[PDB]
Design a protein around this ligand. Structure first.
Ligand SMILES: N=c1c2ncn3c2ncn1[C@@H]1C[C@H](COP(=O)(O)OP(=O)(O)OC[C@H]2O[C@@H]3[C@H](O)[C@@H]2O)[C@@H](O)[C@H]1O
Length: 247
């Protein structure tokens, strides 16, 4: 009452209604998902975490949802990112030069939301949810993202791009979802090159954590490439209008 069970913020208000509406909106826009039944998608989502202990969630819990959300993405146009979501989304919005995970049905449904249930009750917990660090890593949100990020990385081919935040302490972070899940699930048989865009001065492509990334991916038999983006404001402007003196 004046203290909560878990350390993290509770489930987003109107969670059920929100997921359902996002599904409707997504399926009206994208024609190849125009057949999906959103009620059953919701049912599948619910079934992954309702009445389950929010610290004992597994990837199998989410397989019904994964099956319903199966989607073909252009394998050579994938954009990954770490800790730099705003720029990555503004970029893909211009002319769909690339696809991020949130441009998929499943990524779109869950983006920016929090959720969890309770053991031996079918109630949603609007009070609090497990914190990944203080409480447990096997919570419904962390497990959802690990499962979908894995499959998304497995679908990539040819040249794969990643946006990284050059202002952070660790530009490449081995403990992030990109560093711990996506880099290890790219398929060397299909992926020719990983190219990083370091968003800002110095040559950050010489930064020690970037040399670590290069070494990791080279040892997987994948080529590594890196570019500095010194002025992200100018860069976005060039994407919208490559017809510019500055560009
Ligand atoms: N889009 C997305 C996402 N949205 C929320 N979370 C997440 N994790 C991963 N991704 C995808 C994976 C990668 C990397 O995303 P990252 O920034 O490196 O992840 P982090 O470690 O900083 O997230 C902390 C916390 O937030 C969620 C995670 O589950 C975590 O619990 C992107 O390309 C994207 O496709």
């Amino acid at each position: 009452r004046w203290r909560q069970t878990w350390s993290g913020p509770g489930t987003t208000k109107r969670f059920p209604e929100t997921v359902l509406a996002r599904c409707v909106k997504y399926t009206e826009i994208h024609p190849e998902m125009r057949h999906v039944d959103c009620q059953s998608v919701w049912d599948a989502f619910k079934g992954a975490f309702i009445s389950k202990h929010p610290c004992d969630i597994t990837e199998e819990d989410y397989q019904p949802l994964m099956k319903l959300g199966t989607q073909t993405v252009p394998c050579n146009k994938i954009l990954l990112w770490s800790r730099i979501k705003d720029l990555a989304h503004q970029f893909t919005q211009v002319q769909r030069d690339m696809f991020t995970l949130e441009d998929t049905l499943l990524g779109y449904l869950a983006d920016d939301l929090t959720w969890c249930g309770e053991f031996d009750t079918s109630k949603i917990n609007y009070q609090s949810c497990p914190d990944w660090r203080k409480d447990c890593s096997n919570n419904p949100v962390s497990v959802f993202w690990k499962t979908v990020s894995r499959r998304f990385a497995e679908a990539a081919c040819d040249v794969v791009h990643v946006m990284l935040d050059g202002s952070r302490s660790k530009i490449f972070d081995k403990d992030s979802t990109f560093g711990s899940v996506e880099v290890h699930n790219l398929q060397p048989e299909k992926v020719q090159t990983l190219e990083a865009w370091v968003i800002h001065s110095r040559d950050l492509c010489q930064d020690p954590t970037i040399k670590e990334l290069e070494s990791i991916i080279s040892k997987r038999n994948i080529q590594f490439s890196c570019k500095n983006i010194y002025r992200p404001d100018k860069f976005l402007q060039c994407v919208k209008n490559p017809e510019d003196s500055s560009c």
